[PDB]
């Protein structure tokens, strides 16, 4: 589908509220495999299971390994912009 821009708001005491799978070393994008109920990704309304995360806060994720993506994603704080696409 279309590439979309999505805003997520979170406080410092929370995680993002997602599970991810995939990564470059597996030949798979960074994919959302879970949205956890009531946590910031669920509350922002625009992120869904099956979405590929293309970038976060302008940091490209298309060619990142799994653990690289985890470090990058877990470093972001507050008002966070995602670039995602559902295939």
């Amino acid at each position: 589908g279309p590439i979309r821009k999505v805003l997520l708001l979170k406080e410092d005491h929370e995680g993002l509220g997602i599970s991810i799978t995939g990564g470059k070393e597996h030949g798979v994008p960074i994919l959302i495999s879970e949205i956890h109920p009531g946590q910031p990704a669920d509350r922002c309304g625009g992120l869904h299971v099956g979405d590929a995360i293309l970038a976060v806060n302008g940091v490209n994720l298309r060619d990142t390994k799994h653990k690289e993506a985890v470090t990058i994603l877990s470093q972001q704080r507050g008002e966070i912009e995602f670039e995602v696409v559902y295939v």
């Binding site: 997602i18 991810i20 799978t21 597996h26 879970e34 956890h36 799994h66």
Partner: peptide, 7 residues
């Protein structure tokens, strides 16, 4: 087979 991480 693919890893999953909660974040």
């Amino acid at each position: 087979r693919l890893p999953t991480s909660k974040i």
